[PDB]
Write a protein that binds this ligand. Structure first.
Ligand SMILES: Nc1ncnc2c1ncn2[C@@H]1O[C@H](COP(=O)(O)OP(=O)(O)NP(=O)(O)O)[C@@H](O)[C@H]1O
Ligand SMILES: Nc1ncnc2c1ncn2[C@@H]1O[C@H](COP(=O)(O)OP(=O)(O)NP(=O)(O)O)[C@@H](O)[C@H]1O
Ligand SMILES: OC[C@H]1O[C@H](O[C@H]2O[C@H](CO)[C@@H](O)[C@H](O)[C@H]2O)[C@H](O)[C@@H](O)[C@@H]1O
Ligand SMILES: OC[C@H]1O[C@H](O[C@H]2O[C@H](CO)[C@@H](O)[C@H](O)[C@H]2O)[C@H](O)[C@@H](O)[C@@H]1O
Lengths: 279, 279
């Protein structure tokens, strides 16, 4: 009847090798870009002469904004993703005042910029991009990666013109009051959709196919209320130059019923995709 | 067999009383606040000596940002809502360079500011706020108003300390590239939830009850990924000072299954609400 066990009852405080990277390992070249917290430069590892991109963030600016924990999580997540169509994060290091991300270098810029210059893409460039993105999305889902919308701004281009999913916009919607609002008031049914199964990403893929081929998203409007209504009622139309095969794929991806959207493997098998994709 | 009907076949171009407001109708007092596009002043209508708030926007800044159509829609929607717990928009007028909104004046500031000063609210202030918000939400749903999250920042306080839902943050997420990202890639199942039925707003109401009584939202975390997980798995706990009646209401509003959340009329009937609400 004794309750003095041979087991712990003490209070527990739950709040508790090789050559490392160094800044002197890299030659520095021209700046490749700049965000709110990051400064990206062309760089080269000295021993191997290997070209990469070095992103420099300042610890003072990260802590003053309260986004250091978010940056840490992004570095931990991205550095474990290895896929030819996901921008590789080789590693990181830090000194007194700065954090350094050692990144794969994407020489041909973003798809957003390329879409601005060409206005719209032809069926072969589009179908090849979709094959690469479908492959990347399959890898992302198998790793259960929590991610945001894949838009042209989030897509870099490799040396051979292949897609590279980038982690841009990580600081936006990150808990710091945040300017864009957080998720604190959103119910599960509005946030679980992505990650749970493929159907949300398949819809977003359909929007991206349309934007690639047309140059603008299918549901754009002048107000947030009208865009809301067009999406929910699936009110969109095709220009004349969109072919029947493209229409078939986009219309099946943009089904209101998520169960009616074709799986990622069905997208890679679509006759319009296989006919026009070089991948 | 003739197909020349007595009916129109011509191409149609679908792209086509009393005393009005004037700036001289108002005496101007001290500024009440300032946003990105708006400048709010204490004002008084001259004939009646009636105190109100006059919000001044500049047409050049609206058009340069491409949010004029969104402002127009907000003015059209808000000016048709008449509820004691929704900030009244009496009307509007414009001159050469400025747009003017004639608004109900809320003397006691925002609930966000009041929550900062008190750290947390007692059960009587909280239960009364919830009664007012439930009533406002019922009116909003009956009018099928497309709205965003009701947060303390979106809530003003009237002269008697009653809640006033304000239309703050309208320019954010409005199609202009927008800094916070638009809805163009979101599927219906992620956007229909609010407006369709009450269940999304009931969840958000539960979060608000918790934040009122505790001072912080129940699912806050240092990363967006962890907040995601806590919401979807409904991982939150109560401090010691939250009473059983409050726990019962919050836990029923924060059900993962939307059909298990009590209706707005059930919230107004909850024994904890009726015992502590003065409304
Ligand atoms: N690996 C890369 N190769 C080529 N260009 C890059 C690379 N990484 C970034 N850039 C460019 O540099 C810009 C800024 O990158 P980045 O700093 O990562 O943006 P961000 O993460 O969205 N915001 P922030 O982290 O605050 O700087 C990008 O928009 C690209 O134009
Ligand atoms: N009717 C009002 N009575 C009292 N204070 C008000 C009123 N309207 C606005 N304010 C205050 O003025 C601030 C700015 O209001 P407002 O300009 O409407 O913000 P906003 O709509 O979210 N952004 P913007 O429209 O670009 O200015 C608010 O945050 C309040 O503190
Ligand atoms: O023909 C237009 C396409 O040109 C590029 O792709 C070609 O060049 C690459 C580099 O040699 C090859 O890997 C690829 O197989 C070629 O098709 C571009 O990347 C594509 O977007 C264009 O559709
Ligand atoms: O007792 C605390 C409450 O004080 C305010 O409400 C009181 O004052 C109002 C103005 O006379 C009355 O309308 C109201 O009935 C009173 O309860 C305040 O508005 C509440 O938030 C406080 O809980």
């Amino acid at each position: 009847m004794s309750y003095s066990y041979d087991a712990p009852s003490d209070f527990i405080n739950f709040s508790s090798k090789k050559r490392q990277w160094a800044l002197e390992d890299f030659e520095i070249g021209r700046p490749l870009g700049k965000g709110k917290f990051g400064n990206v430069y062309l760089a080269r590892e000295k021993q191997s002469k290997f070209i990469l991109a070095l992103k420099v963030l300042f610890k003072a600016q990260l802590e003053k904004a309260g986004v250091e924990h978010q940056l840490r999580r992004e570095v931990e997540i991205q550095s474990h993703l290895r896929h030819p169509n996901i921008l590789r994060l080789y590693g990181y290091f830090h000194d007194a005042t700065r954090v350094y991300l050692i990144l794969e270098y994407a020489p041909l810029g973003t798809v957003y910029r390329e879409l601005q210059k060409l206005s719209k893409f032809d069926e072969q460039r589009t179908a090849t991009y979709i094959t690469e993105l479908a492959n990347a999305l399959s890898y992302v889902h198998s790793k259960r990666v929590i991610h945001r919308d894949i838009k042209p701004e989030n897509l870099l281009l490799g040396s051979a013109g292949e897609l590279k999913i980038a982690d841009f916009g990580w600081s936006v919607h990150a808990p710091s009051t945040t300017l864009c609002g957080t998720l604190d008031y959103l119910p599960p049914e509005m946030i679980e959709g992505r990650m749970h199964d493929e159907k949300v990403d398949l819809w977003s893929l359909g929007v991206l196919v349309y934007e690639f081929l047309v140059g603008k998203p299918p549901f754009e409007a002048n107000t947030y209320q009208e865009t809301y209504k067009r999406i929910s009622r699936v009110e969109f139309t095709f220009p004349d130059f969109v072919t029947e095969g493209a229409r078939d794929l986009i219309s099946r991806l943009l089904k209101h019923n998520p169960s009616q959207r074709p799986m990622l493997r069905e997208v890679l098998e679509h006759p319009w995709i296989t006919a026009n994709s070089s991948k």
